[PDB]
Amino acid sequence: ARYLGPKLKLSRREGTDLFLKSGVRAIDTKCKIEQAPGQHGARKPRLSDYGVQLREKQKVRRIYGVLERQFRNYYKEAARLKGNTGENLLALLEGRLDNVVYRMGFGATRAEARQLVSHKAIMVNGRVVNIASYQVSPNDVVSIREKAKKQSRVKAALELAEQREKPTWLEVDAGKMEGTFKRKPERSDLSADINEHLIVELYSK
Amino acid sequence: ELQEKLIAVNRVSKTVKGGRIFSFTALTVVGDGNGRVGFGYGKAREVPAAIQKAMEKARRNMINVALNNGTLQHPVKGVHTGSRVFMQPASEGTGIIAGGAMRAVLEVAGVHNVLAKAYGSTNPINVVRATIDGLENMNSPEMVAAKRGKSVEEIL
Amino acid sequence: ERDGLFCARIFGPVKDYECLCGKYKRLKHRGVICEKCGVEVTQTKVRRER
């Protein structure tokens, strides 16, 4: 139910930096980010039409840490919902509790955030929510509870975030350690490199 | 600015007194991400050369296509030889739902959102041609208005 | 330095049409600013006027 292996390998495979490590130390120093994993890394022949789409899908999934069935479900939901499908999917992905936490800066990585969520550190509207897939709504305040507020990791995460660009769709307080999910993010607010359309196509086989 | 996609490359033979002389055909298609599209079919003893030739061919004899935003203006059929093709305009987000050679042509053309089936033959060369034909024939609202002696609001 | 005298977000990217840190290495999306870079995306002489 989770990917427990090497994180940088995934990144290498993808091509890009997936942000699977905190960002204290640059990704180029930790691993050969350009070279693909395994014995046959240096060889890089152009991929197929299907293959590129698949890769794209993987990238997105990897980024958020969502396994396949769940991803499929999300896609379906997006399709069902009104408006642009890929965009909807992206929004849904964002909405995940762990992701939100990460954005806020209470977790160094998304993985860390997820862990925190699991371990009953986070509350959503003053009620302890344990599910990483929990879809956080507009105007839903989300905070660290008083037990987990003393942790050194949390402050480190916050610091890291502060170095990292702040998302417009949230509003977080470092002292209070509570952030308000103000609105579901627009496509423009998210990263431009993610070809959602490819993903959509893949499932529209 | 122009994007160019080699759809297919196929090895073709000519029998001679000695034996078989092999050659390569390259089917490419190029477009500017707007109305302009053009396919090219190049042939040579080696692949890369053939591809280059195809590209060259494509770059000349392009064709303009009226695009309402990211999609087509109305459902359009296009036929050529075996390959008969249907393509239907679709809502933003849906992506290019189309198969093979057909997809490639659409992508370069700068249609982002289509629902497109290739009936009949799916011989890449023919199907791309069919697609092109379909695109070409497809008229815009303004054009139709002009034709009919009316305003755009009269037609809706 | 991010964000010191010679910043990225306040002024512009050192390299032309490149996020100095890492995204956009072609000519398609000139302008996007990810959180990992806190960088604009324009010309090499854009910092001379800013």
Added chain:
Amino acid sequence: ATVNQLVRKPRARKVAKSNVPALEACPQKRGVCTRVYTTTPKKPNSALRKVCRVRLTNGFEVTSYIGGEGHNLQEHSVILIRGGRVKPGVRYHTVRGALDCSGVKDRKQARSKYGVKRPKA
């Protein structure tokens, strides 16, 4: 084709017969080996392919391929067949590692497909 014609006599659906009829819409069937033997395949191939004529539970007498390297089967050995045809007249495979048919010896990849338990170390 003509609508009237269609009305008169509608369109016949192509009834596709099953290529594994001795199963009778069962995922597997139990059978007893009437005889076990090797057979030579058709052109262009060359081998001694191990196969057993099986009398099934439901009454049919079929012939079932035996996959993997080596097998313990004899006459009067109770085996499970699964369907699948080897590319004359063999339309079924013995399930290795079910009933009397053993798993393949010394196999470490695709183990499931030959009944083999996970190697301990």
Added chain:
Amino acid sequence: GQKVHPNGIRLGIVKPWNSTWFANTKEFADNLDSDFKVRQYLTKELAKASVSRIVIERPAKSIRVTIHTARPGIVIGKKGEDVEKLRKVVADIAGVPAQINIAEVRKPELDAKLVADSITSQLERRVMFRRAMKRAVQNAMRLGAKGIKVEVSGRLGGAEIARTEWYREGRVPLHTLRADIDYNTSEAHTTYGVIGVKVWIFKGEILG
């Protein structure tokens, strides 16, 4: 084995000889042997130095070698240090007083042998043979060859079934005797086997 050797057919007319001496039936074989030896030695030594043509010329019980090379600097080394060294060994090989001259080869892309050698080297270091061939052809053309042909043969891309491929550009008349056709050959001793490289370079026609 269809074709006549392009150098060999033209030795009387447009091409000259490499070994250029007179000897009676007594000493001729010995001389030839000596030449073979010295040449062999030179090839062994000046492999890294791009060497095209060794011209031996022995008057009056003294051997005069003339090394045509693209880069004299690596053959000479420090001024009269490497050449001198070469000389004594040459002398030893011969059994007579030696004299080494070093001709500087202008335009090593137009010298056929050199090109062949380069191609062989490329093959050895695992490049795409075809790309190498193209480079060879193109470069020569750029330099002002009236034409060039190159041919490579056997175990191309380590393939089980051996074949030959060849690229021509411009005009390369072989039947025309008065054509200056610089022909030469080489052999790439790859992991899969030998790959023989031929190259013809047509400088132009001589009028006399």
Added chain:
RNA sequence: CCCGCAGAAGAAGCACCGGCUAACUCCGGCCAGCAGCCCGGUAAUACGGAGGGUGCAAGCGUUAAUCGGAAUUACUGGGCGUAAAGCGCACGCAGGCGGUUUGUUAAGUCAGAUGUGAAAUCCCCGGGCUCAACCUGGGAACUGCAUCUGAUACUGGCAAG
């Protein structure tokens, strides 16, 4: 359901990597074996093992079965000179279709209403289980059938041309 305790602790496999099809190398002789369709005879990315990778993941493969792809029974939506496909040719009952004008009818057709079309299910907006599945409020839908009141271009009936 909540609180406390200890300590990374008790918790990852399955299939695949010739092309289709995401993933490649080395070591073991048309045998042993593989196979869904289209390898193996001594350098096998196709057999078996290894290392490396890819895809799924408390599941993963295989088999069986249904629809799909299959516009490959084509109502939507195919064809028949040569690819399968024009009766050897006619007459002709039933059947199908029917030039043009006016009038009338109102069967078909269309419009509106009424009754019904069980609940659940599906779909939309909500609510409740920490989320989800699940449960659940209200709607929409159930393409229909029947009846009543209109419309009369078209098709039909009847009457005259």
Added chain:
RNA sequence: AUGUUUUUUUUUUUUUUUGAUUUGGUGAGAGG
């Protein structure tokens, strides 16, 4: 007068264009 009379895999991927050859203050001395 006559030829389906010795078949076996002796196997299908390019270059691609898109961008340039890189040296700031201080002080001293000479020529006109």
